[PDB]
Amino acid sequence: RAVSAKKKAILSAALDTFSQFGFHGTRLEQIAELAGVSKTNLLYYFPSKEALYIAVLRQILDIWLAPLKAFREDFAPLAAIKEYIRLKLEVSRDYPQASRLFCMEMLAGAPLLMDELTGDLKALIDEKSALIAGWVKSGKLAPIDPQHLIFMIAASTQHYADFAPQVEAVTGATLRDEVFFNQTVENVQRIIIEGIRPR
Amino acid sequence: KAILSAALDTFSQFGFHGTRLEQIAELAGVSKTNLLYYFPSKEALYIAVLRQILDIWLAPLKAFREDFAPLAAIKEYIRLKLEVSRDYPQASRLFCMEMLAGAPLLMDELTGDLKALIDEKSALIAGWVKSGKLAPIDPQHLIFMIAASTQHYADFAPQVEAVTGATLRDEVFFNQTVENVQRIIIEGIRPR
Numbered sequence: 031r032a033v034s035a036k037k038k039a040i041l042s043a044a045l046d047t048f049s050q051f052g053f054h055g056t057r058l059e060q061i062a063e064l065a066g067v068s069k070t071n072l073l074y075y076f077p078s079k080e081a082l083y084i085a086v087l088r089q090i091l092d093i094w095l096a097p098l099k100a101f102r103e104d105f106a107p108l109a110a111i112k113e114y115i116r117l118k119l120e121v122s123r124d125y126p127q128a129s130r131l132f133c134m135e136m137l138a139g140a141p142l143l144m145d146e147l148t149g150d151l152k153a154l155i156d157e158k159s160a161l162i163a164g165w166v167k168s169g170k171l172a173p174i175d176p177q178h179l180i181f182m183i184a185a186s187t188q189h190y191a192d193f194a195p196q197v198e199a200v201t202g203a204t205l206r207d208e209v210f211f212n213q214t215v216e217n218v219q220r221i222i223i224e225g226i227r228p229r
Numbered sequence: 230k231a232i233l234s235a236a237l238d239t240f241s242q243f244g245f246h247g248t249r250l251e252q253i254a255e256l257a258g259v260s261k262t263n264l265l266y267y268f269p270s271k272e273a274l275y276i277a278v279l280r281q282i283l284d285i286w287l288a289p290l291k292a293f294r295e296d297f298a299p300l301a302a303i304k305e306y307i308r309l310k311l312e313v314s315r316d317y318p319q320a321s322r323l324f325c326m327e328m329l330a331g332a333p334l335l336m337d338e339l340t341g342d343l344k345a346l347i348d349e350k351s352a353l354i355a356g357w358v359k360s361g362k363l364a365p366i367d368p369q370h371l372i373f374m375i376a377a378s379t380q381h382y383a384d385f386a387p388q389v390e391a392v393t394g395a396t397l398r399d400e401v402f403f404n405q406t407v408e409n410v411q412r413i414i415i416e417g418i419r420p421r
Contacts, residue, residue: 052330108419111418133325133329134329136388137384144391152392172412172419178410178413182381184381185377196328196340196344199340199341200343218374222417224417225417226363226417228362228364
């Protein structure tokens with residue numbers, strides 16, 4: 031539908047522009063241009079830059095939360111962990127803009143995202159941490175702290191998007207190279223699962 | 230050195246564009262014309278600050294030495310990187326932001342020095358792998374993973390604190406953090 035196509039285009043154009051230039055650096059003229067709509071039209075859907083930035087971040091949180099649902103009581107623990115890693119790397123491959131802007135927002139103190147971090151994201155991480163604790167407690171995983179394990183996977187998988195140019199300077203590849211994508215998944219899993227001490 | 234330290238604190242608090250030289254001078258306890266004699270513009274002083282932070286950043290990779298046992302080297306690299314996140318979180322953040330979104334001249338310089346040292350230490354780890362002293366893993370991925378994981382405490386501090394209620398300035402949380410990053414990377418989570 032026309033109305034929804036427009037606002038889908040505004041949100042997507044805004045994500046690209048805000049991650050490229052930051053909040054303060056971004057102007058609404060640009061987002062409108064890229065979305066192929068008038069400014070008054072953009073203002074109709076989103077009555078200020080701050081309103082639109084917020085909607086964008088809410089969309090990014092959703093993208094961000096989704097992978098954690100790989101932590102299910104019905105998956106074998108290592109399959110869950112492998113899937114969480116894979117899903118997170120898919121985010122870095124497919125939504126690097128989102129990953130980047132999320133990074134930029136966190137670096138600024140999370141001035142607009144603090145509420146979400148103390149709410150749903152925390153709730154979800156506490157929930158999955160408890161689940162992993164039970165896998166540890168029952169001997170299906172080695173004795174490790176679940177919060178540190180989740181942060182490590184998050185940090186490691188996100189790095190490939192956020193710092194893709196640095197990774198490319200060193201490796202000669204990005205996650206858009208499917209061989210590099212496969213190697214990356216394989217190595218992050220292999221390191222976290224098997225460890226680097228020989229078995 | 231007062232101008233450099235004051236500038237680090239201010240640039241990391243307010244960003245490049247947000248920072249004014251008045252403030253740095255104030256905090257350093259010098260006049261502005263004086264600051265301008267040492268550093269001819271805000272950009273010149275910002276660059277010197279980032280170069281100092283790069284040095285702080287590179288130092289931990291020197292824990293990769295041919296004369297360390299491979300796992301001791303890896304443990305020391307992890308520890309040194311967490312010390313940076315504990316002692317220089319502002320710098321870590323300022324650095325991270327500059328690498329994300331800084332001007333390409335400074336960004337080019339910084340990535341080139343990192344690469345150089347990472348190629349060198351990667352080659353060393355490759356040999357530890359090739360000789361069976363480590364499991365078959367890619368050295369570049371291993372270095373990136375440790376860098377990303379240790380830096381996360383500082384760069385994504387607001388999220389870590391929201392979840393944990395702690396920071397690395399709590400020495401018990403610092404010790405827990407070092408032991409877990411090492412335990413996960415070294416031993417893996419699959420039981421042995």
